[PDB]
Amino acid sequence: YFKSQMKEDPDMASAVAAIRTLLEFLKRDKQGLRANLTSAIETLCGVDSSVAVSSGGELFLRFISKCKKIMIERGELFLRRISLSRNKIADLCHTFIKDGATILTHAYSRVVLRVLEAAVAAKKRFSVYVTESQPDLSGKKMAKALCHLNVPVTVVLDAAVGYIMEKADLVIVGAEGVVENGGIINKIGTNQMAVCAKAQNKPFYVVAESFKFVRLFPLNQQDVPDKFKYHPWVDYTAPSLITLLFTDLGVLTPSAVSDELIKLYL
Amino acid sequence: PPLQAVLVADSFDRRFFPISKDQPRVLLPLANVALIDYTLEFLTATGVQETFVFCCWKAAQIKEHLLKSKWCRPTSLNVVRIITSELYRSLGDVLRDVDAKALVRSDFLLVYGDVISNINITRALEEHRLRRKLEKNVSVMTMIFKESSPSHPTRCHEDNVVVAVDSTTNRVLHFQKTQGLRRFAFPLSLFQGSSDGVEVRYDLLDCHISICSPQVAQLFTDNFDYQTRDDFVRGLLVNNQIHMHVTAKEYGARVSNLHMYSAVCADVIRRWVYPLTPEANFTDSTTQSCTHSRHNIYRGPEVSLGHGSILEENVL
């Protein structure tokens, strides 16, 4: 389709790429537009299998609730809100890091990197531990990106997750999707690390935006859709293993995100 | 009647005289706050509604610093009056000046400009007034002490005293310093003239805080040979009564030498003078804001701490 040629900017994610692709292709019409938008969303997720992309596409198409003048104006403002959501999340989350603390991360995440950069701009000293992310090497690239921030970093293997757990002070990771009950959907090496953190009583923090809220209610690891897992690339984390969630709608408890999901009408 | 106090800014001794050629002792910073600011805060917290400040040498600097302080603001409950005179040479001179000027009309407090304390005088003054009224003006001074240990670092050998008091009614009968003294001696008048408590105490820290009487100034002026308060209290008990009080949970000290200055600063850093703490910002100054952290570590704005630096203990 066209999402591939907007991948020229590595800073932006795949879901926002699909959102802006839909916005650009919206002004090509020559009601029945709902079917066209649904087919466009389906073609968009047919290339990349991500829950975040589908949730963002649904939330974008949700603004429906010639007469096309009103419809077009919403896309640019929506994109601006997603753009400012990252800064808002970073501002809300940078206050939870103290001097000399140890931070454990799983893989590459632009939100976590922005939060860390805000914390470093707040004149704080900390160390970061990143899992090597064996399936696709992204933890080492995250460490390389953090290297020029003058932040001490160290990459560890995904096998050595419970070995350095006692040396960490808090755990913050991103999320590819927030389910209705309160859990998160992330990389494969997330649930076991959360379990280890819970066993060691270490805090578990999740940072995600408001366009990743999906309406799913899994009960185990096999309840997630098969199209999203594809060696699986995605798992499910129980809401009881998450301490706090930092979004653009404010700090929310795992038991409080359900009300936000319902009010979002997604 | 409103409570009044007399503050002697100039320290007539020259203990701090490698450095005082540029700044007075009262303006020396202990924890980035002037000692006179500490004394003014203590006086305001204790309930003083009118403070008299006497300046003798380097009076211009103290006067210009006081006006910038919060105690000189119109919305203050402790009016501060600055009196400058170049003829002062000892505390007795300022007391005679106060007697001649009739500034005081009731019981007042006599403290120095380098006294750091958090003692709230509300019961010692009450009992002093009660025993003054009951006996029809026989008690003239009620000195304030603090119970401590002789081995404490805050008990300097140059400011160590031993007194003999009455257990029944607190009243000082003997006062002497222990500077270079090994075998102290006490007069026989106490034992052979009275009874019912002639105990001797050697666990009192001199806070240099006293509750005076209007006749104290007249007694000072009558004898033109008194310079310091120690001479007055030593000469009064030679013939008027001097009583005493002890605090057990509060803090009080007067900076006199470098050792005691360091001890008082260390005590202040470790929150021994609560609520007078560096992070409390009692001076109401924008440039003295601070945040309290673990291990009594205090950091202000724009600390710009580097990488690898370790703050092992209480650091300001």
Residues A247, A237: Cα–Cα separation, whole Å: 17
Note whether residue B134 is domain-resident. yes
Cis peptide before A152 (omega within 30 of 0): no
- The distance of B312 to chain A (nearest Cα, Å) reads 13
Q: In one letter, which amino acid is B151?
A: S
Kindly state whether A148 is in contact with chain B, defined as any CB-CB distance less than 8 angstroms.
no
Indicate which technique resolved this structure. cryo-EM
Q: What is the DSSP letter of A247?
A: E
Q: Give the mutation candidate from B307, B310, B315 for the A interface (greatest A CB count, under 10 A).
A: B307
Q: Enter the tokens of residue A185.
A: 């959907």
Backbone angles phi, psi at A244, to 5 degrees: -145, 155
Nearest CA in chain A to B302: A123
Kindly state whether A125 is in contact with chain B, defined as any CB-CB distance less than 8 angstroms.
yes
The residues, any chain, with a CB within 8 Å of residue B227's CB and separated by 6 or more, are: B89, B90, B91, B92
CA dist A124 → A90, A147, A171 (Å) = 15, 16, 17
Asked if B226 and B92 count as a contact pair (C-beta separation under 8 A), the reply is yes
Kindly state whether B305 is in contact with chain A, defined as any CB-CB distance less than 8 angstroms.
yes
Helix axes B35-46, B59-68, angle to 10 degrees: 50
Q: Phi-psi region for residue A103, left (φ > 0), alpha (ψ -120 to 50) or beta? A: beta
CA dist A170 → A138, A194, A263, B148 (Å) = 21, 11, 31, 45
Nearest to B35 by CA among B292, B276, B298, B286: B276
Q: CA-CA-CA-CA torsion for A42, A43, A48, A51, nearest 10 degrees?
A: -10
- The distance of A149 to chain B (nearest Cα, Å) reads 13
- The distance of B302 to chain A (nearest Cα, Å) reads 9
Nearest CA in chain B to A126: B307
Query: Strand order in B200-201's β-sheet?
Result: B172-177, B161-165, B200-201
Note whether residue B263 is domain-resident. yes
For residue B53, the cross-strand partners are B7, B82
Query: B5-36 burial string, b = 16+ CB within 10 Å, else e?
Result: bbbbbbbbeeebeeebeebbbbbbebbebbbb
- The distance of A147 to chain B (nearest Cα, Å) reads 15
Q: In one letter, which amino acid is A255?
A: S
Give the resolution to one decimal, in Å: 2.9
Q: What is the DSSP letter of B79?
A: E
Residues A36, A47: Cα–Cα separation, whole Å: 17
Asked if B71 and B78 count as a contact pair (C-beta separation under 8 A), the reply is yes
Note whether residue B301 is domain-resident. no
Residues B97, A177: Cα–Cα separation, whole Å: 82
Domain at B104, CATH number: 3.90.550.10
Note whether residue B51 is domain-resident. yes
Q: What is the CA radius of gyration of chain B?
A: 20
Write out the H or E segment, with its range, that includes residue A33.
Answer: helix A33-47
CA dist B268 → B40, B46, B117, B159, B276 (Å) = 16, 18, 10, 20, 8
Q: What is the DSSP letter of A169?
A: S
Residues A89, A185: Cα–Cα separation, whole Å: 18
CA dist B261 → A193, B264, B271 (Å) = 54, 5, 16
- The residue count of chain A comes to 266
Q: Indicate yes or no: CB of B307 within 8 angstroms of CB of A123.
A: no
Kindly state whether B307 is in contact with chain A, defined as any CB-CB distance less than 8 angstroms.
yes
Kindly state whether B292 is in contact with chain A, defined as any CB-CB distance less than 8 angstroms.
no
- B310 interaction partners in chain A (CB closer than 8 Å): none
Note whether residue B296 is domain-resident. no
Note whether residue B284 is domain-resident. no
Residues A21, A216: Cα–Cα separation, whole Å: 25
Q: Range of B39's domain?
A: 4-270
- B305 interaction partners in chain A (CB closer than 8 Å): 99, 123, 125
Q: In one letter, which amino acid is B63?
A: K
CB atoms within 10 A of CB B164: 20
- A123 interaction partners in chain B (CB closer than 8 Å): 303-305
CA dist B206 → A117, B175, B254 (Å) = 54, 12, 8
Nearest to A246 by CA among A148, A145, A49, A112: A112
Nearest to B118 by CA among B209, B204, B27, B3: B209
Asked if B110 and B230 count as a contact pair (C-beta separation under 8 A), the reply is no
Kindly state whether A123 is in contact with chain B, defined as any CB-CB distance less than 8 angstroms.
yes
Nearest CA in chain B to A121: B304
Residues A218, A220: Cα–Cα separation, whole Å: 6
Note whether residue B194 is domain-resident. yes
Nearest to B255 by CA among B271, B278, B273, B242: B273
Helix (H, G, I), strand (E, B) or coil at B294: helix
Q: How many distinct structural domains can be found in chain B?
A: 1
Closest partner CB to B304 (pick from A99, A123, A150): A123
Note whether residue B258 is domain-resident. yes
Q: Indicate yes or no: CB of B303 within 8 angstroms of CB of A123.
A: yes
